Amino acid sequence: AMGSMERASLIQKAKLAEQAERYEDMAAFMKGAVEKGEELSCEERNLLSVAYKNVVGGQRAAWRVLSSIEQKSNEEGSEEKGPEVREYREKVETELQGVCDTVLGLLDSHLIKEAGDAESRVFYLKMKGDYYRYLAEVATGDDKKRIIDSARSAYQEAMDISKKEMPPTNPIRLGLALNFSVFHYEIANSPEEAISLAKTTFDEAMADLHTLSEDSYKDSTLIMQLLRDNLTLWT
């Protein structure tokens, strides 16, 4: 994608697109950068993640609005009004699935296989879990179970590496645990597993904060607060 643009120019333009809040452009620039075939630095991995999180986030928010309207239309006493709500929800759903499939394709061709360091491998396997989780949010057919299992398997492999290779305050390790706990709660119907994971992760991070500089302490405690926010909603 963007095959005639230099890799450095694609990265530079992704940063400009981020400043301009042009996330579809940012994602396209980063997709082009990945397709150059070189590994991504930590900053470049963050740009890839920010770009697609914002694109899929808009699609998810729209899908939730449309799904709610569609569910209300299927209640007792609701007037017919036709196929339009379902059609338009399906359109948005298909577009969201396409974005997820594109991110999963980048991870599979060939980000994950070329990621040897723990920081890069865990980042990409967390992303794989996240985008299968977004596919799961809208899945209703005979592959929902396989989609859920793919998300679980990616998060589990990421968690196994993170626990062996990263300290408990590492922001990627923390964000992974946060998102896997949300997977348990919202996708896997395992609220107790979600609560246990969030609590253990929070407590183990708290016990390690003494090792950190002021800036690393700020980074870790910001994510810890998100675990606490979920625990307060769930308990």
């Binding site: 964000g175 946060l178 994510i223 998100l226 979920n230």
Partner: peptide
């Protein structure tokens, strides 16, 4: 819930 609910 927040992902990184609150999500990451």
């Amino acid at each position: 819930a927040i992902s990184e609910h609150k999500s990451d």
